[PDB]
Amino acid sequence: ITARLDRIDEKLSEILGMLHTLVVASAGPTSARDGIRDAMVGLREEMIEKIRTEALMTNDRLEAMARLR
């Protein structure tokens, strides 16, 4: 059934929230803040994970060229 539009809408809501978070994290330094390191998402592990996957997909091409060698 085409009820995965619910998941698509959930992902879009997540993207909206994180976009607002980005535009406030860029410039909210004075009154949206009393110290540093505002309460936020701070999840660098998914970033490291996408870096892993992309570097591994590049290493796959390198290793295929080496296999052809």
């Binding site: 997909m57 590049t58 091409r61 060229m65 052809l68 060698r69």
Partner: protein, 1367 residues
């Protein structure tokens, strides 16, 4: 044993801070500016300034100044004083007038030989010709303005010559001269110039470069007046002889005087006003070429620009001199505002000189380098660019997305065009469905069906590696003769120790112990020579590992030379590598980096300061695409990632910063004038191709947003935008109104988008036009070209463009420069007479005043003239000099310009052209007819010359390596030597001691590598020197030879690793011996005994000049057959006819113009380019982006070798060893990458660096359009004589001859002929059939050459790289 040879011409810049320091120390106060330079110069002066101040004459002048007797002025005041000097009466007057009369008479007498030869060959036929007799009658009274500029130039050059000679003789010599230029007292070193005028009670202090500039001004004005007088006399005789421009010289002298008054009223700041006059001349041009609205807009903009420049000059002058010693030097006409009267009169004189004539207006561009050069304030230019490069830019994210998407779209489109597919995408899931179809079909949409949404979508595309970085550094691209910046810790070594604090001096003496000898080099060459740990894969590792990021040694040094920026060696390597990778991989995708009415306009923008507006957010959105395409990161983004974290410092010698005590790190020194941080990118020159292709991408984005076509052409610091847009004309709207409206709207849009990406265009940089084609500084209107040819020959003088004052290079430079009065100015006679004026000056007048060879060269030339008088039975030494100055420099004569160069630019055989030139020149004395077959008449002079040319003692030595280096070399000491042959042994002796083991080991094996390279191809019995050149360019010895030849052009080769600007006496003696042998060569080539009294004199009956040239070339090398080099001379082979014969049987050149004159006119025919017939080659299908450029070049060379030498007995072994050694592949693997050549004759079609690609005429391209050529009647004759057999006569040169011949006949007869028929001498044409080569290549010697010079071998095609080739 070390001498210092100073400049005779301004090569560097005039320094504001050097002048300020010297004059501030000498007068004990702020001289030009109240900055740190004056304070540090007065507190701790340099020793060379203390030497000037402590002279007795300087002490007396300072005493007078401190008593109020003399007044201190600015160097421009004294420039105006000098350019007015005419003091002395009747003695210097008679002497100078007699000298100028003599120079002019001798120049006309030397030109008479060539004019007679030309008129005798064209069939138009002390001074023999009537034309030059009338000209000598016209030019026997030099006018007062010419005498004035000649006298001034002579005095200034005498002062300079005296100083240079006594400075070679004595180090530390200060010239003190108050007698040469009467009224002025000069005190001249290389470290300063103090000029004092006594009756005016004025004194100025300036630099040696300023005296050089003054002498250059006087020379430039003498040259303007001389060219204009020659041209006016020629046009009085014949309106077709002189130049197309006609100048009144009293108006020109008034121009000079009024520009001098502008520079005297406004001080150094007056060069702003002087520079803003190019706009006034362009407005006078557009008042003729453009239409009312365009020309009115440009005129108003130009007036605003000039008055803004003058107001800024006044304000800056008043603010600068307020607290200096020049506070009472500003005239009242500055505050009165009455300077506008002077400016008005200057502009009116410019408009009078232009005479409402496109020729005069285009020529008047010499005015801009006729007034000298300004002293540039280095700290002030630093401060001007700081505010632009520190400014925060604000971008819409959609603007950056559209710019990145337009760049990516151009990349995709060019990649599909050149490689037949999209680039490899690593995130192709981001394309919606409409771009997935283009990706899978390997197509792209056009800019019309493209959308801004499409560009935003494409901005999300990432790529895989397409192009590969070279792993071994190309030493040819990374070595030069410029200076290197020291590291950040050693940046205080760029200033004198006196100017630096004591703690800075102690810190430098302690920090030099922590750096290598390469990091303490100050020069690029010795930076690389002193590297005992140099590795060829060092740059590759620095780029892969990003060793340039966050480097503590990074600094940007700025030098007054527009603020030439420097950085240490690592970062300079990275910059050069990024620019080279762009130039050789990406510039192929950006080819412009070289209704009832369709509206059209033109927008011209100045991109000189385009870099300062670029930030990371605008340039690196595209540099990231380039990084991904190369599999690397931050290589093309290196500038905006590293420069923001370094310090920008002005490192001129006399512009030190104030370093606060206890501060010793440059990044801790206080920001000040000439010293700032946080430079948000945009260094000029660096990353220029990146910003060019980004400008092209933005132009595509603008064309998409404005819905008009764009034809951009970005040539350096200037882009031209041809805009087209199909509109529908409104009620009663004219085409001009529509074009102007299009220009206005397109200007609005261009401004809006450039401001979107952070560049604020200014109305002074950009102007709109409609039809006028002004690109590459050339005026071109209605198809006709309008040259500025007087501007190219302003600096023609004795010792120009030469090293150690080489006589031969000076003559060659004079000829090459003066040839532009004929190539562009379309005047053979004006070019000839001007060249002979300055060649006679060089030979007869300045050769006895050599700074290193005091008069030995003149005694040698007198020996040569006596020998010529004895040989050719001449009347005196004057006739002998006239003959010497017309003999080719190949035989040892003094004529840099052969006669063929007046009719076609290129030739495939210099020896035949030299022999033909000599025959034509000696016809002036032997009275031979150049329209007849060669004959023995009574005079054996030409017979004696030709006998001496063909008869000599054979003495070949290293013939094959020499024919590799120069396929047209002669051997047996039959030609003049060049500095690269004389200096190369010294270069290798110096390089053998270099700490760098690459250069050391390549120089230690240099002699044996030459011996082996001579043995490789020595048993191939038919000698093909162009095939030898192809063999030589495929071996690693060619790169070593290029490095050595670059080093050998330096002054003082032996002092390269000595850290000195002095010249060693051994280099002086080597250059002196070389000059003397080159001068006296004509004695050894033409022996008085004719070298044969046993073999009788040569008989010129049925003599082929080309057979004689082939014999000379073969005998000089003691070879039997030399193929593919000798070719007929079309000037000699072709007989010129003006009436139709019985049957044509020649090349027929007809004038399609209807007028009797074609100069300054355009015809219906297509321009003639030359463009020799090209090869037929089948390119193999493989992935060429997998290979670097050097690997593909090596593959092309090896394919050419397999083509030319396919018939040698050793071809398999030869090609196998070449492929293994240079490419790393076997021959069977490398052969699949070779282009297969379908052309049978490689003697015709082989493409080498030693062969001309084009054969143009000695005539502007616009002029070739007036004539039509027909080579049909000569084809039947050539095929009935040589049926289906190849011959050595060049076709393109045969048409070039006819076109230039039409032009020259119009020049000399005042009427263009209706047709010209070129009938060939068939005994001068021979077969050129590709031979069957016999013999074996020395394979042992080949592999020993490869193994000795292995440090210069290119990258080898890997297995990983070879598997990717055919996927």
């Amino acid at each position: 044993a070390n001498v210092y040879l100073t400049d005779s011409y301004l090569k560097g810049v005039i320094s504001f801070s050097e002048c300020n320091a010297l004059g501030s120390y000498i007068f004990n106060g702020p001289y030009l500016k109240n900055d740190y330079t004056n304070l540090i110069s007065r507190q701790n002066p340099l020793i060379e300034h203390m030497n000037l101040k402590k002279l007795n004459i300087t002490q007396s002048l300072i005493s007078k100044y401190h008593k109020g007797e003399i007044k201190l002025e600015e160097p421009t005041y004294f420039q105006s004083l000098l350019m007015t000097y005419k003091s002395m009466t009747s003695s210097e007057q008679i002497a100078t007038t007699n000298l100028l009369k003599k120079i002019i008479r001798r120049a006309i007498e030397i030109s008479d030989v060539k004019v007679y030869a030309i008129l005798n060959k064209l069939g138009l036929k002390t001074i023999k010709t009537t034309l030059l007799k009338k000209l000598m009658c016209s030019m026997q009274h030099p006018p007062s303005w010419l005498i004035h500029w000649f006298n001034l130039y002579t005095k200034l050059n005498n002062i300079l010559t005296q100083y240079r000679s006594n400075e070679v003789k004595n180090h530390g010599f200060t010239l003190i001269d108050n007698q040469t230029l009467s009224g002025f007292q000069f005190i001249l070193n290389q470290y300063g110039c103090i000029v004092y005028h006594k009756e005016l009670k004025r004194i100025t202090v300036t630099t040696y470069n300023q005296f050089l500039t003054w002498k250059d001004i006087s020379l430039s004005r003498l040259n303007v007046c001389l060219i204009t007088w020659i041209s006016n006399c020629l046009n009085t005789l014949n309106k077709s002889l002189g130049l197309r421009c006609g100048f009144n010289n009293v108006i020109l002298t008034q121009l000079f005087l009024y520009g001098d008054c502008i520079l005297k009223l406004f001080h150094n700041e007056g060069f702003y006003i002087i520079k803003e006059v190019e706009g006034f001349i362009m407005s006078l041009i557009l008042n003729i070429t453009e239409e009312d609205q365009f020309r009115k807009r440009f005129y108003n903009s130009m007036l605003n620009n000039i008055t803004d420049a003058a107001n800024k000059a006044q304000k800056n002058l008043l603010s600068r001199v307020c607290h200096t010693l020049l506070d009472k030097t500003v005239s009242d006409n500055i505050i009165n505002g009455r300077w506008i009267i002077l400016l008005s009169k200057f502009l009116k004189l410019i408009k009078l000189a232009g005479d409402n004539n496109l020729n005069n207006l285009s020529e008047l561009y010499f005015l801009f380098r006729i007034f000298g050069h300004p002293m540039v304030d280095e700290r002030q230019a630093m401060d001007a660019v700081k505010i632009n490069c520190n400014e925060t830019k604000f971008y819409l994210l959609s603007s950056l997305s559209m710019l990145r998407g337009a760049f990516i779209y151009r990349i995709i489109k060019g990649f599909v065009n050149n490689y037949n597919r999209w680039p490899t995408l690593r995130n192709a899931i981001v394309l919606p469905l409409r771009w997935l179809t283009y990706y899978k079909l390997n197509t792209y949409p056009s800019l019309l069906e493209l959308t801004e949404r499409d560009l935003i979508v494409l901005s999300g595309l990432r790529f895989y590696r397409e192009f590969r970085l070279p792993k071994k550094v190309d030493l040819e691209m990374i070595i030069n003769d410029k200076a290197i910046s020291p590291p950040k810790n050693l940046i205080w070594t760029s200033f004198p120790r006196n100017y630096m604090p004591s703690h800075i001096q102690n810190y430098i003496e302690h920090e030099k112990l922590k750096f290598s000898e390469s990091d303490k080099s100050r020069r690029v060459l010795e930076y690389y020579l002193r590297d005992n740990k140099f590795n060829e894969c060092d740059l590759y590792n620095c780029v892969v590992n990003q060793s340039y990021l966050n480097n503590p040694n990074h600094v940007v040094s700025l030098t007054g030379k527009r603020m030439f920026a420097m950085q240490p060696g690592m970062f300079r390597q990275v910059q050069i590598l990024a620019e080279k990778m762009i130039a050789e991989n990406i510039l192929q995708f950006f080819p412009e980096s070289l209704n009832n009415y369709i509206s059209k306009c033109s927008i011209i923008t100045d991109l000189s300061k385009f870099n300062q507006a670029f930030r990371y957010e605008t340039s690196c959105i595209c540099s990231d695409v380039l990084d991904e395409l190369h599999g690397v990161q931050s290589l093309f983004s290196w500038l905006h990632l590293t420069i923001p974290h370094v310090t920008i410092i002005c490192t001129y010698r006399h512009a030190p910063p104030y370093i606060g005590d206890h501060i010793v790190d440059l990044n801790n020194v206080d920001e000040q004038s000439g010293l700032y941080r946080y430079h948000m990118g945009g260094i000029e020159g660096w990353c220029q191709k990146l910003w060019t292709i980004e400008a092209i991408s933005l132009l595509d984005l603008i064309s998409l947003k404005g819905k008009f076509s764009i034809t951009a052409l970005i040539n350096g610091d200037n882009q031209s935008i041809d805009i087209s847009k199909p509109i529908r004309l409104m009620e009663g709207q004219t085409h001009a109104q529509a074009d102007y409206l299009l220009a206005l709207n397109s200007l609005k849009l261009l401004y809006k988008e450039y401001a979107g990406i952070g560049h604020k265009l200014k109305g002074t940089e950009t102007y709109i036009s409609r039809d006028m084609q002004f690109m590459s500084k050339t005026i071109q209107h209605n198809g006709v070209y309008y040259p500025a040819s007087i501007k190219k020959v302003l600096r023609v003088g004795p010792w120009i463009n030469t090293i150690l004052d080489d006589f031969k290079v000076s003559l060659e430079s004079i000829g090459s420069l003066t040839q532009e009065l004929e190539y562009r100015g379309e005047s053979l006679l004006c070019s000839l007479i001007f060249r002979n004026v300055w060649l006679y000056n060089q030979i007869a007048l300045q050769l006895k005043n050599h700074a290193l060879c005091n008069n030995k060269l003149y005694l040698d030339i007198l020996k040569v003239l006596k020998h010529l008088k004895t040989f050719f039975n001449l009347d005196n030494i004057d006739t002998a000099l006239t003959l010497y100055m017309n003999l080719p420099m190949l035989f040892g004569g003094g004529d840099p310009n052969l006669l063929y160069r007046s009719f076609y630019r290129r030739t495939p055989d210099f020896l035949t052209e030299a022999i033909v030139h000599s025959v034509f020149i000696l016809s002036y004395y032997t009275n031979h007819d150049l329209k007849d077959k060669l004959q023995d008449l009574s005079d054996d002079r030409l017979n004696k010359f030709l006998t001496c040319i063909i008869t000599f003692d054979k003495n070949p030595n290293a013939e094959f390596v020499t024919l590799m280096r120069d396929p047209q070399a002669l051997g047996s000491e039959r030609q003049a030597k060049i500095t690269s042959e004389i200096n190369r042994l010294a270069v290798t002796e110096v390089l053998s001691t270099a700490p760098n083991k690459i250069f050391s080991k390549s120089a230690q094996h240099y002699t044996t590598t030459e011996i082996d390279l001579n043995d490789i191809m020595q048993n191939i019995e038919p000698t093909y020197p162009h095939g030898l050149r192809v063999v030589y360019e495929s071996l690693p010895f060619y790169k070593a030879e290029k490095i050595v030849n670059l080093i050998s052009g330096t002054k003082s080769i032996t002092n390269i690793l000595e850290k000195t600007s002095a010249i060693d006496l051994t280099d002086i003696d080597r250059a002196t011996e070389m000059m003397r042998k080159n001068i006296t060569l004509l004695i050894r080539i033409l022996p008085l005994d004719c070298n044969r009294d046993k073999r009788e004199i040569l008989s010129m009956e049925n003599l082929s000049i080309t057979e004689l040239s082939k014999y000379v070339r073969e005998r000089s090398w003691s070879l039997s057959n030399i193929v593919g080099v000798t070719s007929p001379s079309i000037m000699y082979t072709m007989d010129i006819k003006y009436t139709t014969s019985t049957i044509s049987s020649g090349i027929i050149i007809e004038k399609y113009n209807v007028n009797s004159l074609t100069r300054g006119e355009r015809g219906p025919t297509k321009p003639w380019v030359g463009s020799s017939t090209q090869e037929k080659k089948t390119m193999p299908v493989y992935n060429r982006q997998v290979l670097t450029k050097k690997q593909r070049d090596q593959i092309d060379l090896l394919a050419k070798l397999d083509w030319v030498y396919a018939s040698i007995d050793n071809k398999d072994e030869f090609m196998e060893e070449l492929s293994i050694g240079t490419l790393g592949l076997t021959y069977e693997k490398a052969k699949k990458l070779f282009p297969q050549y379908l052309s049978v004759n490689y003697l015709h079609r082989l493409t080498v660096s030693s062969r001309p690609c084009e054969f143009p005429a000695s005539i502007p391209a616009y002029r070739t359009t007036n004539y039509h050529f027909d080579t049909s009647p000569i084809n039947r004759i050539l095929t009935e004589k040589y049926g289906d057999e190849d011959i050595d006569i060049v076709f393109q040169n045969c048409i070039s001859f006819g076109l230039s011949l039409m032009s020259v006949v119009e020049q000399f007869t005042n009427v263009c002929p209706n047709r010209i028929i070129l009938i060939p001498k068939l005994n001068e044409i021979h077969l050129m059939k590709p031979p069957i080569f016999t013999g074996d290549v020395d394979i042992h010697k080949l592999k020993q050459v490869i193994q000795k010079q292995h440090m210069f071998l290119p990258d080898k095609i890997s297995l990983t790289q070879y598997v990717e080739l055919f996927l």
